[PDB]
Amino acid sequence: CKMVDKKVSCQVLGLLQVPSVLPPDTETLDLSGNQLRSILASPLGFYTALRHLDLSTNEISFLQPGAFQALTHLEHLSLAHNRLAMASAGGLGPLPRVTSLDLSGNSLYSGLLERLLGEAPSLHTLSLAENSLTRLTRHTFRDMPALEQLDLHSNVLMDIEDGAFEGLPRLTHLNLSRNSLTCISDFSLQQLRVLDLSCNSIEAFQTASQPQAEFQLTWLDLRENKLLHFPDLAALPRLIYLNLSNNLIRLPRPLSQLLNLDLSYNEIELIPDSFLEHLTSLCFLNLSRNCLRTFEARRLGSLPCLMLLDLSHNALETLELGARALGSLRTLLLQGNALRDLPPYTFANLASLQRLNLQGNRVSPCGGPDEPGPSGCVAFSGITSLRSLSLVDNEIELLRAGAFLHTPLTELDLSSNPGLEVATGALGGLEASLEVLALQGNGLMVLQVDLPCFICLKRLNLAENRLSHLPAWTQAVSLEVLDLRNNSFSLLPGSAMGGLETSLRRLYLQGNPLSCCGNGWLAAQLHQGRVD
């Protein structure tokens, strides 16, 4: 047994009884992991200076009725993962100075607690997780008015009679996740602040009416349940977080302070007009994996504060966003929908947009301000704030010239658009700012864009395009990664690939038909420190 300063450590294994050869001035004492089977008052009472006592993971099953009342200076006591459920006799008595008590993993049951645990004036935290409780009666928690936190997850609770929390006037955290509750009929805990009811079977949720003072609740979690309607939360004016993901909700000031609302994986199909009007302060909103077909924000000044909107994997077909609306939006995710034809100036009215993801739709970009394209194309010509764009798998046949003329974006992605042909000057304007470019899987014969002018380009991806010849670098460009796998490169002259050695870091060729003749530069690179 190690000792340092009024503290004793007893190791993982090797004991069957409480030791007695310890100094009598100890103040901490650890015994987890051993093979203890009971706690008798005699050896333990010698240590009247204890303040912390850990007895978890043993096999303790019997506690002498007076064992813990000799210790008058405790503050913490842990008895987790023992076998207390086999204990008529035994139990804990008064515990005046205790402030924490852990009883999780013991397999207790309803009715045993009122005899197991006695008085506790100074308790602040109590943990009863991972037991076999089923019902909370008016008699359960008694004589503990300083309790503040109560952890009851991973039980089997089905009932909560009225008054079970009346003896707790200072509680502020309640945790009832992973239980078996089915219907909630009332809510009257004025002073509570955090409530966690996730992973249950709750079908309906309703709160009280006409309180003396407003409820203080500010954090509510009801994800992964069976709710069928958006709950009525008119009496909770302080709420800041709310999470209703993975339910069955269908849609048909209360929420003037909500800042986070998650509403994914439900069965919503149409959004009433007045619903979005109340949410004045919202900053994040997810509506992914629902069944919407349109989204409207026509009214000017609606959603003033929103910074993220998520609509992926719905079935949208049009977007009626009006100008001077969504003026703060920065991220807009729309992948997996069926958008085809849009008004030309849809995305150019968003004043702060910075990241757009359009993968999997069938959008065809415009052709620059000068000589635009046909009707129904979308204009990416002048979105001054945009910084990232994704157009994977949109079946783009033709990429017109000047498509991104006045958008100083720093990342593009055009992969998996077979039969793509890039008109000359299509990528004009991006030389000064573009950093990443991907064209994998397109299959184009020859690349018309003049790469060596791209000063800032760092990563480039050209895999699975069936190229055979590549333009020539003749300076110290900033490129650092280059991918050419599964192309048709046979010979790599050192003339065209000079100047890249100043900055190149890694590189790939596997899958190409390299020729044994020549290729001295490639051999030199393989000799050098460049990866592969």
Partner: protein
């Protein structure tokens, strides 16, 4: 933060009625009810026509091998169930009660052997054998009994044709009770160690280990009705019409 004690079930009753409508039409394979005929009297022939828990728990298995032919101190175990052996018309008797790889599995005729034995006792055949025993070790408003019980149980309801369904063409009977099933079945979350009084809740709240249990009927009964077309009456019986119990499945 109370739990939930009372729930209204008018919507379930009205949806049940609406479904009974279409169900009876389909059982009678019409796309619309026939318009009522004139009030007619029943003949005498129709009048004469009118006058006229141990499955849940696991079993130990004990095999007792052999020591128109005859088959015959086996009171070691004192278990229940009968044979399933390794190998015209041909059938089997006892020393002469009729009993029937093969199988003759009733949970008896070795209960009697356990109870009383004689000099010879065995099975007959007439115009690697063994036995297999199975028994559970010892340690292992028709159908609900509390007013507005919150469990899965059967609820009462009365169906009468002229009022609810507007069916003038139904003559017998005036109505009947079409009870329904309601109440939730909670999903119980498992653990490796759990108290022995909670191990009895699986048998009734989720016996099938489904991911979402449902409250579904268990016993159902048929309904006989009478109706006229033209001059000829028609006596038709429909099946699966009245509930007698429920179940969580």
């Amino acid at each position: 933060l109370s739990t939930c004690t009372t729930l209204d079930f008018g919507h379930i009753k009205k949806k049940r009625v609406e479904a009974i409508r279409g169900q009876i039409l389909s059982k009678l394979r019409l796309t619309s009810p026939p318009e009522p005929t004139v009030m007619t009297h029943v003949p005498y022939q129709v009048l004469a026509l009118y006058n006229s828990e141990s499955e849940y728990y696991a079993k130990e298995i004990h095999k007792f091998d052999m020591i128109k032919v005859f088959r015959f101190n086996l009171f070691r175990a004192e278990f229940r169930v009968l044979r399933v052996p390794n190998p015209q018309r041909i059938e089997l008797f006892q020393i002469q009660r009729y009993i029937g790889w093969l199988s003759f599995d009733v949970t008896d005729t070795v209960r009697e052997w356990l109870l009383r034995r004689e000099s010879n006792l065995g099975l007959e055949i007439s115009i690697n054998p063994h036995l297999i025993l199975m028994m559970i070790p010892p340690h292992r408003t028709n159908y609900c009994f509390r007013n507005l019980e919150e469990n899965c149980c059967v609820r009462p309801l009365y169906i009468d044709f002229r009022q609810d369904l507007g069916w003038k063409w139904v003559h017998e009977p005036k109505g009947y009770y079409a009870n329904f099933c309601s109440g939730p079945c909670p999903y119980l979350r498992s653990a490796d160690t759990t108290h022995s009084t909670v191990l009895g809740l699986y048998n009734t709240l989720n016996p099938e280990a489904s991911a979402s249990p449902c409250c579904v009927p268990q016993d159902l009964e048929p309904l006989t009705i009478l109706y006229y077309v033209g001059r000829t009456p028609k006596v038709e019986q429909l099946s699966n019409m009245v509930v007698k119990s429920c179940k969580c499945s």
